[PDB]
Every structure is written in structure tokens, then in C-alpha cells.
């Protein structure tokens, strides 16, 4: 533990500071023997925990068998594989008809790939972006992500090309967000260029856990196909089962433009991305965008293996409908212990993607420093880092569920003297 | 292959040139569900220095698998990115005298660059970056402007890039006229329209641009101009680094020591996406957190990565085979470029180790030579502005066998179209 | 005419008043066609004292008689030395107000440029806030905070940078507070708001559709301001010079700002002329860093300080602007009554002599504009639609004439109906 | 007199360069307070080319102010507007067979730069605008980015510049170098980092950059290279024009025509602020209202230009008049640039008609003559990236006497200042 080799830029050796070994489920290993129960997973990169088998064996058997690991661009069998079976197992039992493009293996790439998309499409600069959202740092998503941290850091670079809404509850409650925006989208001086595009998230990921109203969706869906203006549903955090559908948007049956995938898509925590859209939009030209990594095998044959073993009927999909409701239950219990004792706290979420606010970073951090002593990996987000988040995995054995559950509320009461 | 074309979007190149399905590879050979068989000339754009799933490197990362190592990291430590940053400094940095840290932006030759540039802009507090005419350096918002090419930067959807001035290249301006002097020039000239810059971003052996090599004077005297006015020297080695130019780190040809190296494709060794930037220790201005993104901690490029360079750099010799195997295709270019000039066609070479261009006139006669060479069984691919330099970016791996092999299948490719 | 093909297609006011134009003195024109006409526009607020007003005439071919240095550059000049102190003695100091003066280009749009950069090199933050339907010039750097999408589409390919919109008073509806909206995105990490150096806001919104801010209003936005570290700029370069009612739109409200553009009515003449007033404090400028050659205009000094002596050297002049005013207010209620009882619902807004009569559509308020031209009456439009008709009329005119202006603007909206 | 130092912010710099009083001026004499009276070589940076308070100008302003004449027309048609079109057409620009139309923009040199660039950017649909190398233009954001001088560029308060692209101006690259051809490359090299332009702006004498007077030979080349690649050339004649080079428009030198004239600094000829847009008619892209200006109808500057169109260049006496004076101006630079450079300060001359320069060595000699020169009786400033060039810029009008006079007060305080 003598690193003193990486950057001052760290983030989770700072908050977990052990090195870890082997993983398995929600089960992690560091050196001095200790185990951990997960419920960071990757930041919901691993939806089906670490190394699962299926996904396990998948992989190992291809590389075994010298399947093409770098394919840039090129056709091969596991990207025809990939894309049948999305189309097959995914996209055709919803009733959704898109394309795909394959980016960069990162979140961020996609997001760019997906505005940049938007922009040509409609001849139009603008991106609507949502208070709280998130969608990556690279200088042309960063315009769409509102953390000043990030935003601050460039060195000089003011973003550009992007227009703040206010996400549906940030002025209230019942207190309709959308009506401002409608009114802007109609007022030639009202300060708002035409958007080619509003990027979303369905339930806010690093913003603090904030699921949009569904009524709110549907309207926001109509309010584009009135103003010609593309949805883009950012389902990078959201997405693969977060939910408990496999697409966050299908709770409001809509059918955005483009959508953009990335963390557990591949499955098994491989870097791994796309961007699914309508196939009229396809308006991309050969060549006209591209990324060393976007023919990624390997992840094209883990992401195939879990869309086949888990997604083929709605068993897994109404597991963790199941699941979250748990999460959810004592998650509300937990926020009227801290608020029986005066400090507030609230739950919401939606699926597996939970979140416990209580008053201020200071105090989540407390909770969650605990956890990690106690054994349970779990982490914050919100603007202040007020949210704890449940980002378990979707595949998480009940006991070690109700087991990680019962290690944060320990952690809470040992907090509350 | 009609799930391929009906679902993959229009954006494709590469299943364009190469309309086949790809199944199994090995070292430089590449097959198809059709029974065609290729020698690689173009190693997933020098992605695959060591050839394709190279046993010793494919060893090692089954074994991790079996073992159920942690695949994302995230950022927490792991074994195997301690033993990554290990292997780093003994096998790699310390024998070249070399003092850097390690940072990780995603995987990815684009993120790399823009921590890289956003890294240099806090560190000096000026924003504008100075790059060369025909660098590329990647397509994402941050990046674009530093890439010279127009096909992606009128694709931006209305948003002019914003950030960096361009410098003419080595070369750019005739033979022997220093474009460093016009630099020069403009950096102590107040209205001279050069924003005062941060740092200077330079391929030394250009990829994308043509195969051109800056030449060792210049490079060192863009070193001492960089000290000379405050200025960091990034040096973008994604391409031209991991070997391809006949030493580990391209820039080691001209005894400079950058204050900012980007890597990406080779450094997993394996094709897994991959990149780290490479700072002088101080300049580790980064608060926590300020830069992110998800697969950092991507431990099986972890262990690839230590794998190859422990397997391939713990000494000198697989160094200096690049070297003579970049001689060979420097013979077999020159001859190429010989009988297609005194055919009434000029012709040139260029390059620096197994990172070599045949530079035909036109775009339209390198795509003919091109497409034969692939009904012939040679897969490679054009670079250049116009697309007029057949490259070179065969593995270093590649067996004399494969090598005399493939640049057999170019000549009697170039012979063929001339007829 | 040679009017119609050397002049380029920019044109506004030559498609709506083409008659040509020779003798101009008071709230009368006088054609070339030889019919007089009553001025409601006086160049859109710049000719508060109407067309060639006598005592400024006077001081203006005096100075010319005796071969007054016209052009000063940065020089001083005892015309220069003039404007400052009488603006010094008869308008701030008897106000309370300490202010330093900046002399920029003589057009609104320079003085907007050099508040704004003036504003960021004081507070280290790029960005400016501003308010739907603002307007504040469209020079590319004054044109990020203007709102109008007439002007922001036709950069040719460049979008601004460095400015963010917020909700005006009233912007949300009845009784909604649009600065709670604010001043949570102050204190919201990520909800999209780059720290602002500045807010920058017309008191009424000129080109808006007269859009008067409450006074409570304004008096809030000033606590925000100082609790949370920004420059407020209030851009007075069409409600000031005493449309309002007082010299300083900012009057009615108590509050002071850290930085006042004046430009249309500043020379009292027609003469291009603008300042920028700033607190002393903030006279960050380093020698030289924004220049503009027409800088020093000796003869809108000469002018703009006859002016301050002539009108505001006492509370006269203020008070009949303040009852002209209530005038056009009686005039436009019942204009506004008229319309609504024959189903065209319409409304009177304004404070001072900058009033409004709110039609509902652009195109009827654009009958009753060009109608009014027909019967002698110059009358222009502003608003999102050109959905309001505007009362910028001198505020020197006589009652005869403010009466006659209205008595024609009453018959050319019956003649509509 | 000390209110002008507290009422007024530190941004003054022809405050500090010049402190006194000034009272009553007329041809190139201005009294002071102190009533000191002195020769003006600056003339408003080149505004005054008819010097002060022109008797006959004076007559027509004086009478239409009488007459009650409308001052502030907005866009309204009166007669002022109409006989300024007139008396522009039939005076100028037919004479030279020139077919362009007006737009009137707010009365600056910076509106006027932004209409034009604004609406080259509208008819090509390109955003980029390729400026050269020390070019000023204006400190607006939008003229800022064709502006070479950091002093302006780094008071933004952090928002870089965007949309334009700088060339090095002729003579930039040393002694016969064109320029132009690293211009044609790279407007032909796909990643060689030009994005391709609108338009590109130039003052055939370079104005605030230190009187540098691009040659005829170039001048021409760079209207076929526009021509060619479909790009507009405006031409930047707040400074240079309006007679000060020896011709109305200085590109009359040349013969070429551009696509875009801007005007502003001697257009009205009596020191009021006005500007105009000259286009060829095609060109007329724009919409209605598209681009605003509240000043852009002020009558009276109609009335003095058009006045000082017809006094001054109805034939080509006085044209050739002011080409006369740039002689014995040139000569006695020259004599003066030899006397520094034989006292061991090498100096030089250079100018086209009566925009000249003497460049010394360094802004502290300049400052040095620049100052004695001031108690000598003569306003004198410089000009160039570092204020080392000493500009005359006296009105073109001024008589022999004068002439010879300030150039003799320059002598005596460069003597003064050496030995
Ligand atoms: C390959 C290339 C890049 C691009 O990185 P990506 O991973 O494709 O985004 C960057 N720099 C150089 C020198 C390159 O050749
Ligand atoms: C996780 C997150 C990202 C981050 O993308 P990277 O792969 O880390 O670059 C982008 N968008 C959303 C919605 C996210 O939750
Ligand atoms: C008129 C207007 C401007 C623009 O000023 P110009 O002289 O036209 O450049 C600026 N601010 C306000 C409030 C305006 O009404
Ligand atoms: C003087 C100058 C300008 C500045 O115009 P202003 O009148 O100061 O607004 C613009 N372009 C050129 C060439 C100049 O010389």
C-alpha cells in the first residue's frame, strides 16, 4: 500500500482505502482477509454482480477459441451475434425498432455521440440538459452535466451549446417544470434556442436519486414530438435492469429518439457502450465519427450471454421489482428513525435504484465511512453528497440483501450515539 | 451478413473496405467464416502490437478470470493495478531515466487527451493549446480541437471547436525552412494572433496526418522553445508508442523527457481498451475527483499490460528486432516507390521503425492498390489528408515469414493495378 | 428611390414609415410629402426631449461656432470636464450615488460589452445572468444575453457563450416568485448554473413588451445580489434618462446598483453617446484594455451636460413626466376596455412615459400601427410577437400633442374593428 | 483640473499620453487651457483626414442643425440618408466602377467589423474567418476574435475568442517569402487545420500592427486565392481609408475589387462617430432586421460626409495632393530612421501615402521621442505590437507649413533624445 504513483484525481481509494483481491456476487475480498458486501456494484456497472458464471464461461470459452478481440469496425461473429440478439431478445418483444451505432466504450462517449447525432439530425446547436443531470466530462458532455466541480475544472473552457430546465420536482412539488419549459420553447425572446434534442435521465443517477413522475415523462415525450425535438434517454446508470424493466423508459411506455447504454451492459464489468436510435435518424456519414475500441469482442459476447440468460422471460425483470420493494421498505424505515430523532431524512427510487437522503454529506459520510468498517461497500451522490445510494446488484441473493441492509442500519444507529 | 448491414449504423469504415465476417485470429493472421484467410497490416491501427491474442498475454489474463479477480475496479486498489503501476516504473520508466506519475481516464485515446490538455490548462492558467497541421488526437468535443481533420470537424452539429491554434508542422512549409522560427516568431509577438498557450500537443511520428516523422533536431528544439516560454510539451504517443517506432516511447529517438504522454491502444497489449496519461510529479495539480469516469480501474488491461511488458520489454531484444524488421519494409517500400515513379507515377517512403507509408499521389490510386491487396489476402489501410499513404502498422510481432509474406502480397498488388 | 437599391434589406423602419423625412423639431416630423406627423417613437427612447430641442440646439451650435475640439479621443477637453462634473453635481451626488464613470463607443451595445467584461475581470467567474426576454444590443458578446432568436440565429454558425437565462417577474404566472427559482440554483452544485460574475437587467423590459419588474421584486434581487457575491448591472438604456418617471429607472426602488449602461438619451440630441457607471471600488481596468475610437464625442458631452442642467436641476421636470405618464395610462386602460368588450382581449402595462398596450396578436397590433401612420401617428411595436404597441413619446411633449397622439391612436384602433 | 482624474476610470490611455486641457481646434492646430498650442500628427487615430473643424464641412453642419433637420433617423428614409447614398454612388464609387450596396450599422468600427464578418458568415455558411497576423479590427467579442493583440484577448474575464483563424501577413516569414502559399496549402490540406473560411479580413496597411503595407503583387494574389476557394475578401478600411494611403479606398493600389468595404474613422470627416458596410449586391443575404443599431440613422453625418465627398473628390486633385505629402513625409522618416541607425539604434521608414511609420528599436524609445516630441509642441503616438513604431497620421489636409512643422518638431526631439 505504498502507491504513491496514482494522481491526486482518486476518488474510491480515498473512501475504501483496502486492496482488493478476488470478487464474487456481491462478495468482495481485499488482501488482509476481510470480505465486503456490495452494494455499489461498479456504480451499477455490475447489474448481475462480480464474475458471474454464465458470463464467466462465455468469455473464457471465446477467448479460448482465438475469437478476434480488437475488431475497430469489422463485421465478425460475435458482433452479428450481439446485434441478433439484441434485436431478438430485447428490442423485438418491446416493440421498439432502432439501430445501432457503436462508440466509444465509455458513457461519455456515447453521450457525445448521441448530441452530436441529434445536432446533424435537426440542423439545430442546442441540447436541453436537466437540473442535477449527469452525463459525463469530456468537453462536449460536460455541456450537459451540471456539477460545477467538473464544469469549474476545465481550465478556462467555458461549455457551450447546452440549456438548463428544471427536472420535475426542483420547484415544488405538483408544481408543473414543464409548463416553463413549454412556455420558453414558444417565446422567439425568451432566451432558449430551438433544441435539436432534450437528453434525460429517467431517475437522476448522481443528481441524488431523483425519478422522474411518469404522467411527467409522457408529457415531456409529447412536448417533443410537438417541437421537433429528439429525447434522448441518457439509460447509462438507469439502464439493464436498474429499474426492474430493462429500459428505465418503459415504466412510461414512450419511445425516445436515441438512447444511450453503457455501464452494465457488457455484463461482466467490461468497458462496453452504444447508441440505439430510430432508424431514420441513421444520418451518420462513413467515417464521419469513430473510437479505437468500438468493436470491443470480448464485450460484444459477455453482453450477448446476459441479455440470453437473463432476459428471456420477465422472471428475472419481476425480481427485482421484488427486490427493490425490500430496499425500499427499509430504507423508509430508516429515514423515520433519523427523523424521529430530528434529523431529516426521505427515501425514494425506483427498482434497485434506491436512495436514502438524510441532511448533508457530512452526515451520509458518516453513515457510509461506518458501513465500510462494518463491511458493507456503499456510496453517496446528490449535489452535497446527502444521498446514499443502493446500487446493489440486480442479482443479489436475498440473503445478502436483507444482510447488507442490516449492516447500514447498524452503521446508522452506531452513528446515532 | 445481413444482421451486420441492416442494424449497424451507417458511421462503419473499416466492415466497408473488409466486407467479410472475421472469426478467429492468431499473431499477424487474420480468418473469415468464408474460408479467406489475411495477413495484418493494419493490427486494429497499431491497437495490436503483439500480434492478435498472444499466447503469454492470454495466459495471463484466463488465469485472472479463473481466479475471479475484480474485473471494474473502479478506482479502489487492486492487485492488479498495483502490480501495473509496479511493473510500470521498474520495467519500463526507471531504466529510461524516466520520472512520471500515473493517471486514468477512461479507456480511451480521446479521454486520455482531454485529462492530458484539461491537466496542462489548470497547470498554467492559460487555455489555449497549441497543436500541429494533420495531428489527430481524437473526435470527442474536448479533443476535436486539436485534430487537424475537417471530416470531423464539420460533423460537430454547429459547434465551432474551441481551445487550440495550429502550428505548421516539421516539413509543412518546403524543404529546409524551420517552421519552428514562425512559432517562435508568434509566441514573442503581441498582436500576432497566438493566444499565450499551456502546452504543445505533438505526435511524434504523425498517424492519421501521413506518416510523418518530425525529425530529431526539431523535436529537441521544440523541447527548449517549450522551456523557454512556460509551455508544457505533451507528447501523443497512442499510435507511435508501445514499440511501433523501434523504441518503447517514440520520443526516446530524441533524448527529450515530455511533461505530459498520453498512451492508449497497445498498452493492454490485447486489444482490452486501455489509456494513462504520464506527468512529471508536480505537475499533479488535480484535486480528488475533479476528473472521472467509469472503467478506470479496468484490471484485466491491468494484467495484459504488466504481462506484456515484463514479457516484452525486460530487455532490449525485442526492441531492436523492431528495428530490423522496420529496415526490411523500409527496403520493400523505397523499391515499391521506385517502380511506381519510373512508371510514370511518383511514389515516396517515410517513417520511423515498423511505423512506415508508401505515399502514392492520389487518394484514388492508394484505394486501388488497397482494395487489390485485400482480394489478394493483405489487409491494410490508407492514411494521409487525401488518403495517399499506404501504412505500415503490421504487428512487431509479425514472423519474417508473415512480413516478406505481406509485403510480397503489396508489390504484386501494386504491379497488378498498374495494368 | 436610390433609397430602396443602395439600401441593403437589413431595414426596419423604411418597410413601415416610407415617406421621406425633413423637419423634425419637438413631437412633430414633417415630411417630404408635406404631412406632419406625432412622434410616439422619438428613436425608440432616445429622444426624451424631443427632436432639436431648443436650450440643447443652442449649446450644440455654440460649441461648433467657436471650433470646439469634436472629437477627443481620450483626451480631456473642457467639454469632457463638463459632463463629469455636472453629472457629478446636479444628478449623482444629489441621489446618494458614488459612482465612477467609463466612457466606451457610442453605440448601447459597447457600453453592455465593456459592463459585462468589466463584471467578469472584477468577480474571476465568466458567466452573466440574464432574464427571458431581455435585450441588450447584438454584438456577439452583448448577444449571449440578449434573448431574441431573430438576432442569436443569425451569428452564422457561432453560438454565444457566458450567459445563462432566468425567469422574469412574472415569467412563471400569478403570485410565483421566480427569484426563489434563482437562488436555489446558486446554492445547487449541479443544478446547471455557473456561479454568476453579474446579473444583468433592464427595470422594465424595453423590447421585452414593457415589462415593469415589482419593486419588491428588485429589491430582493439586490439582497441576492450582495449575499451571494454578485455585480448587479442595471441596464438603463431605454428606460433611462427619466422614462420611468425618474432619472434612474432603479429610483423607484431604492436600490443601487454596481453598474449602469446609459446610451440612447444621454446626449439629449440624438447624438451617439453611452457610459458605463460603476461603483468606485470596482474600477478594475488596467490601462487600455478596451478602447473604441469615437470614445470622447465632445459634442454629446456638450449636450448630455446642458441637458442634466436644463431638465434636472430640480424636481419639476420629473413630476409632469410622471402625470404625462398617468395620462397615457388613463388613455391605454381605456383603449385596452374598448378592445376587450368586442372579444380581442388586450391590457395596459408601463410605469412613467415607457408604456405599453398589450393586443393579443402581432398581426393586429400591426394594423393599428401601420392604421396609425395612415392618420398621422408614428407608433412602433414591441414584445415576443410584436404583441404590444409601445408609448416611447418625448417626455418634453406638450399636452396638445400627447392628447392628439392618443386621440389618433383611439380612431385608428376603431377604424380596425 | 484634477475631476478628470477621479470622475473617470483608470482604462484611459490618450489621458496619460497627453495631459492637458483642449480647448478650440481647427486644420491640425489644437489650443489648450494652458494656451499652448500644438500640431496634430494623430488626428483621432486617423479620424480627422480633413483635420479639425473643416470650414466647409462646419458650413454644412451648422445649416442643417439650423434648418432643424432630423438628427436621429433610426432606419426611416430622409433626405440626409438619401443624399449620402446619392452623392457616395456618383462621387465614388461609379468613378471607380464599383458596384456595391450600403448597410448601416451601429456608427463604430467594431459594429462595422461585426455586420460584415456576421454577414460573410451567412452567405458562404461557413462560421470561420481567416484574419492575419498583428490585424485590429475591433475589441467587441465578435470583432475580438479576428483582433491579434493579447492586451485585448486577455481581458475577457475567461471567455476565449471563437471563429476565426490567423495567417501570417505579408512579409511576416522573413525577406521574400509569399505567405500566401502556406495560405494555399492549407486551405487544400484536409487535417491541416483551417477550418474552411467565410471570408478573410484585411487592412492593406496594417493600422494598430505598425504600418506594415501588404504589397500589390500580394494584394492580387490573395484576391484570386479568395475567388478560387469561394471565399469573400473584406477588406478593413476604418484606418487605412478615406484617402489616407493616396486613393479613397486603399485597395485601389491594387485594382483588385473586394466583396466587402467597411468604413468608419474619416467617413464623416468631421470627428462624428459613423460606419458603413459596402457590399456587392448579390451579397445582400441578410433578412429584415436580422442586425440592429440604434445610431445607424444619425443624419448628420450624412450631411458631412456627403459634403466631404463633394468638396474633396469630385476630381483627382487632392488625391494626388496628399500622395505629394507622403513623400516629403517618407523622406524626412527615412532621413531620421538613418540618423539612429548611423547613432548605433537601427530604425526604419515604411508607409503607403500618409499612413507611415518610423520603427525604432523598442516601445522605450518610441515612448522617449513620442514624449519630448509632446513638449516640443507636437502630438505624436505610436503604434505596433510593442508601440515601437512612431505613426504620423497627420490629416491629410494639412498644409505645407504645418507639415514641415511637425516633421521639424520630430527632428529636433529626436536629436534632443540622443545628441
Ligand atoms: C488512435 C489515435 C487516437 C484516438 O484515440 P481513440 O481511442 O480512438 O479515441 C489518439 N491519438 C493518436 C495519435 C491516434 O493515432
Ligand atoms: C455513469 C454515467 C456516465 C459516465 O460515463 P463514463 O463511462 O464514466 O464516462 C454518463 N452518463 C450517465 C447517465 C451516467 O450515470
Ligand atoms: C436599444 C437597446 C440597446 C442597444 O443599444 P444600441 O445603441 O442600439 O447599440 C441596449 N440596451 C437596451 C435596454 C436597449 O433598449
Ligand atoms: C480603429 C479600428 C477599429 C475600431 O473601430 P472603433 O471606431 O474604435 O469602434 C476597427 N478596425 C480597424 C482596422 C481599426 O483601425
Redesign the interface.
Known amino acids: 500500500?505504498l502507491?504513491?504513483?496514482?494522481?491526486?484525481?482518486?476518488?474510491?481509494?480515498?473512501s475504501?482505502?483496502?486492496?482488493?483481491?478476488?470478487?464474487?456476487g456481491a462478495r468482495?475480498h481485499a488482501?488482509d482477509g476481510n470480505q465486503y458486501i456490495d452494494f455499489?456494484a461498479?456504480?451499477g456497472?455490475?447489474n448481475y454482480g462480480?464474475?458471474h458464471p454464465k458470463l464467466?464461461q462465455a468469455?473464457?470459452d471465446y477467448?479460448?477459441?482465438?475469437?478476434?478481440?480488437?475488431?475497430?469496425?469489422?463485421?465478425?461473429?460475435a458482433?452479428?451475434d450481439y446485434?441478433?440478439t439484441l434485436?431478438e431478445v430485447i428490442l423485438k418483444p418491446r416493440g421498439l425498432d432502432y439501430?445501432?451505432?457503436?462508440p466509444?466504450?465509455?458513457?461519455?462517449?456515447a453521450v457525445?455521440a448521441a448530441?452530436?447525432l441529434?445536432?446533424?439530425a435537426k440542423?439545430?446547436?442546442?441540447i436541453v440538459?436537466?437540473?442535477?443531470?449527469?452525463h459525463?466530462?469530456?468537453?462536449?458532455?460536460?455541456?450537459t452535466?451540471?456539477?460545477?466541480?467538473?464544469?469549474?475544472?476545465?481550465?478556462?473552457?467555458?461549455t457551450?451549446?447546452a440549456?438548463?430546465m428544471?427536472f420535475d420536482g426542483?420547484?415544488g412539488e405538483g408544481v408543473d417544470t414543464l409548463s416553463?419549459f413549454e412556455?420558453?420553447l414558444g417565446?422567439?425572446?425568451?432566451?432558449?434556442?430551438?433544441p435539436?434534442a432534450v437528453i434525460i435521465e429517467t431517475v437522476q443517477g448522481?443528481?441524488g436519486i431523483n425519478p422522474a413522475g411518469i404522467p411527467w415523462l409522457q408529457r415531456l415525450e409529447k412536448i417533443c414530438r410537438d417541437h421537433d425535438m429528439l429525447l434522448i434517454v441518457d439509460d447509462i446508470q438507469a439502464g439493464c435492469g436498474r429499474t426492474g424493466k430493462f429500459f428505465s423508459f418503459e415504466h412510461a411506455g414512450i419511445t425516445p429518439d436515441i438512447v444511450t447504454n453503457?455501464?452494465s451492459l457488457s455484463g461482466?464489468?467490461?468497458?462496453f457502450a452504444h447508441?440505439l436510435?430510430r432508424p431514420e435518424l441513421?444520418i451518420?456519414?462513413?467515417?464521419?465519427?469513430?473510437?479505437?475500441?468500438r468493436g470491443?469482442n470480448?464485450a460484444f459476447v459477455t453482453a450477448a450471454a446476459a441479455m440470453r440468460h437473463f432476459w428471456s422471460d420477465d422472471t428475472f425483470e419481476r425480481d427485482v421489482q421484488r427486490k427493490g420493494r425490500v430496499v425500499e421498505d427499509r430504507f423508509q424505515k430508516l429515514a423515520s428513525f433519523m427523523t424521529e430523532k430530528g434529523h431529516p431524512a426521505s427515501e425514494r427510487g425506483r427498482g434497485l435504484m434506491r436512495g436514502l437522503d438524510v441532511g448533508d454529506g457530512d452526515m451520509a459520510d458518516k453513515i457510509t465511512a461506518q458501513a465500510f468498517k462494518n463491511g458493507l461497500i456503499i456510496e453517496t451522490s446528490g449535489?452535497?453528497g446527502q444521498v446514499i445510494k443502493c446500487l446493489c446488484p440486480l442479482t443479489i441473493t436475498d440473503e445478502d440483501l436483507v444482510g447488507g441492509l442490516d449492516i447500514l442500519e447498524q452503521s446508522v444507529k452506531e452513528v446515532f450515539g
Not at 466509444?104 to 462517449?109: A, Q, Y
Not at 452535466?145 to 481550465?155: C, H, L, P, V
Not at 461482466?268 to 468497458?271: A, D, N, Q, S
Open positions: 500500500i502507491e504513491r504513483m496514482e494522481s491526486e484525481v482518486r476518488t474510491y481509494s480515498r475504501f482505502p483496502t486492496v482488493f483481491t478476488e470478487a464474487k468482495l488482501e455499489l461498479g456504480a456497472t455490475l462480480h464474475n464467466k468469455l473464457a477467448i479460448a477459441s482465438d475469437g478476434i478481440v480488437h475488431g475497430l469496425d469489422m463485421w465478425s461473429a458482433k452479428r446485434l441478433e434485436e439501430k445501432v451505432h457503436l466509444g466504450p465509455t458513457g461519455t462517449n457525445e448530441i452530436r441529434a445536432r446533424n440542423g439545430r446547436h442546442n440538459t436537466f437540473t442535477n443531470g449527469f459525463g466530462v469530456t468537453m462536449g458532455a460536460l455541456a452535466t451540471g456539477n460545477r466541480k467538473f464544469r469549474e475544472a476545465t481550465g478556462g473552457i467555458p457551450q451549446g440549456s438548463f428544471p426542483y420547484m416553463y412556455k420558453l417565446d422567439n425572446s425568451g432566451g432558449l434556442d430551438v435539436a448522481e443528481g453503457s455501464k461482466f464489468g467490461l468497458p447508441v436510435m441513421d451518420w456519414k462513413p467515417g464521419q465519427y469513430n473510437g479505437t475500441f470491443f470480448l449535489h452535497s
